[PDB]
Write a protein that binds this ligand. Structure first.
Ligand SMILES: Nc1ncnc2c1ncn2[C@@H]1O[C@H](COP(=O)(O)OS(=O)(=O)O)[C@@H](O)[C@H]1O
Ligand SMILES: Nc1ncnc2c1ncn2[C@H]1C[C@H](O)[C@@H](COP(=O)(O)OP(=O)(O)O)O1
Ligand SMILES: Nc1ncnc2c1ncn2[C@H]1C[C@H](O)[C@@H](COP(=O)(O)OP(=O)(O)O)O1
Lengths: 176, 156
């Protein structure tokens, strides 16, 4: 019963935080899983990709292919990437659909204002000052999911509420 | 914990056969494992890569980076490609060893003569962790050789 839990959302909306708490819950309940994120991807397989529209397109494509393999192998694969473009997220869904694997698009949704008040790594302030260019939500677009399987309201639910909602979806869809 | 079993050898030497047999043995002993081969890599992750030297180097680099994720995830990852160039296998190796993830270069070794008599350029591994003489060992014997290797380094 492998599947891919595809997170998407602005920088600082809560993707890393949710993925890690979701991965902890699953391991403790004896469900194999693995998380793909900036740390293990953008410095390994995707070390040769930047942040131009084309390189974010290829970033997501390779991640989709990789996730599909983990899902195929029997793991719950959590991906934790901004994935700002609808086309690429829809392509990632297609990849899993073609291979008959369950794909759950989870919109991790905190408003831009909350993300920048959180400013977890000081990035929004730099982006605003033009010291970083093409930052998502300031200088390049984030296209919100039109029909995700789940929307996580990370400004109104705490981390554990969010994890429980994802687990709920996984139960209803017969993964766990 | 996890590791990469990196098969290398001529066409018809026995990589597909060994990997299928090894994966079967591991799974029925409750050990997680997944195989990367042309069937799940070539038209997916590496579909935007052609036949040029630069693309073949990038082909191997990506496979090695995906295998490392499976090892890190805790699976025995078996890769099954001809993998002809020493520079490329060393690259794959360094990707793993730099993260302290166990990496086994396994030479699937049958003479060219036999490989053609099978009918289902290459640079021979310099110091591979294991040689499988597939002309003189049967499939099950080759599997036990790999499993014995895995048992030594606390993988299996
Ligand atoms: N130009 C940028 N836009 C958005 N995030 C960036 C940028 N440069 C570096 N980062 C950062 O890289 C992370 C986002 O990387 P990804 O999630 O891999 O983005 S994606 O758009 O290609 O999906 C952010 O947490 C972050 O701090
Ligand atoms: N319900 C929730 N889910 C996730 N994070 C939350 C949250 N409520 C508050 N936070 C906080 C914790 C983190 O400091 C911050 C999110 O940062 P993050 O998970 O690193 O973001 P991202 O990975 O999307 O860039 O917001
Ligand atoms: N010990 C052994 N290991 C692997 N294959 C063996 C073998 N002894 C005989 N064979 C036969 C079985 C297959 O028909 C053939 C191997 O072909 P294959 O596994 O498709 O090669 P490759 O994947 O290396 O191209 O050789």
């Amino acid at each position: 019963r492998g599947c891919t839990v595809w997170l998407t959302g602005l920088s600082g909306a809560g993707k890393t935080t949710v993925s890690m708490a979701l991965e902890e819950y699953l391991v403790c309940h004896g469900i194999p899983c693995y998380t793909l994120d900036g740390d293990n991807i953008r410095q390994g397989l995707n070390k040769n990709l930047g942040f131009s529209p084309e390189d974010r397109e290829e970033n997501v494509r390779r991640i989709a292919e990789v996730a599909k393999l983990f899902a195929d192998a029997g793991l719950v694969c959590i991906t934790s990437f901004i994935s700002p473009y609808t086309q690429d997220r829809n392509n990632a869904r297609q990849i899993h659909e073609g291979a008959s694997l369950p794909f759950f698009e989870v919109f991790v949704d905190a408003p831009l204002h909350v993300c920048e008040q959180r400013d977890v790594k000081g990035l929004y302030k730099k982006a605003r000052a033009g010291e970083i260019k093409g930052f998502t939500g300031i200088d390049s677009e984030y296209e919100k999911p039109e029909a995700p399987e789940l929307v996580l309201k990370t400004d109104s639910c705490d981390v554990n509420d969010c994890v429980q909602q994802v687990v709920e979806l996984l139960q209803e869809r017969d993964i766990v």
